[PDB]
Design an enzyme around this catalytic site. Sequence first.
Site, PDB file in Angstrom:
ATOM      1  N   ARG A   1       0.884  -1.140   0.000  1.00  0.00           N
ATOM      2  CA  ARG A   1       0.000   0.000   0.000  1.00  0.00           C
ATOM      3  C   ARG A   1       0.935   1.205   0.000  1.00  0.00           C
ATOM      4  NH1 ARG A   1      -3.457   4.271   0.242  1.00  0.00           N
ATOM      5  NH2 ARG A   1      -3.411   5.390   2.239  1.00  0.00           N
TER       6      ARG A   1
ATOM      7  N   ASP B   1      12.544  12.060  -1.294  1.00  0.00           N
ATOM      8  CA  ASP B   1      12.037  11.055  -0.361  1.00  0.00           C
ATOM      9  C   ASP B   1      12.917   9.838  -0.366  1.00  0.00           C
ATOM     10  OD1 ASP B   1      10.279  10.133   1.669  1.00  0.00           O
ATOM     11  OD2 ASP B   1       8.823   9.369   0.220  1.00  0.00           O
TER      12      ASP B   1
HETATM   13 MG   LIG Z   1       4.876   7.955  -0.915  1.00  0.00          MG
END
Ligand SMILES: [Mg+2]
Length: 327
Positions: A46, A155
């Site tokens: 997910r 990220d």
């Molecule tokens: Mg993400």
Amino acid sequence: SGPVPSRARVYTDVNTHRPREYWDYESHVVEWGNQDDYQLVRKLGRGKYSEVFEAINITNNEKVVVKILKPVKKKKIKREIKILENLRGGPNIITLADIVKDPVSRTPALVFEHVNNTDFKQLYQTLTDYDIRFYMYEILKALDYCHSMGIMHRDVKPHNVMIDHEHRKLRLIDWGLAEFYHPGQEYNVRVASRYFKGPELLVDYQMYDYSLDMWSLGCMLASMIFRKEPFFHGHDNYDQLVRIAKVLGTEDLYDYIDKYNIELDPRFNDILGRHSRKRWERFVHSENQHLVSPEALDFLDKLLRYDHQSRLTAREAMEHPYFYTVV
Ligand SMILES: [Mg+2]
Ligand SMILES: [Mg+2]
């Protein structure tokens, strides 16, 4: 006078010299093919705005991954798609193979190259000194490429690095926070993931650049060579800076703030306290010493710096002695 401006030391003007079509992602037209060519096999994970499945392309038997999107702003999806298309084919960049939609539900989806990943929570503890050097060099190939392409990932973390250990194959994924670098831009600092946020984000210095990714990479390296994951374990974004200050020291933090004329959020003075730098050798012990070398510590020391301009660029990092043993 406000904060002092900053520019990237590398690839500074690469987007300035490209036509609008390359970087103006909001103007990009997305066309969605038919998801019927893909048969879903099993759930893999997910995401922040997706459910990801292993699938098979029924027309040619190719094993792929289908990232089925949850509702998100059109601007955000166009950014992820345009960045994936601009980086497609680059070293260690995940390939966006298709953009599709189910005919009936209309749910949009991104189709990617499949990586048979071993989650970092199982893999990292098994890596040898050579393996850490090898995989770090692979991440650097992806970052030097994407930075040269005018893109910051924003990220970098273990969760976003897929590794097929059997085939020594690495791919950098999750381009949902990535952005185009334009020198002078004051960016949103609500990017990256807590434990991997650079000090520029934590002190609200907006004019950051590709060097943000190099801090995140240094957090990953420290966790791997020291077997301490995550390395800086803050309870929130403010305590995250305290965790960093307890290692790098407060003197250099306040020097960084002064150099850039950064207005420090008032809650910091009470929580930061006063801390001397903790020498990197203090993190070395019997269970991690085989992953540590003078070259590893010198490399880490040049990534985990407050002043983003003083960090190694990805290309400088690839030339570091830590990688001299890498084939
Ligand atoms: Mg993400
Ligand atoms: Mg992910």
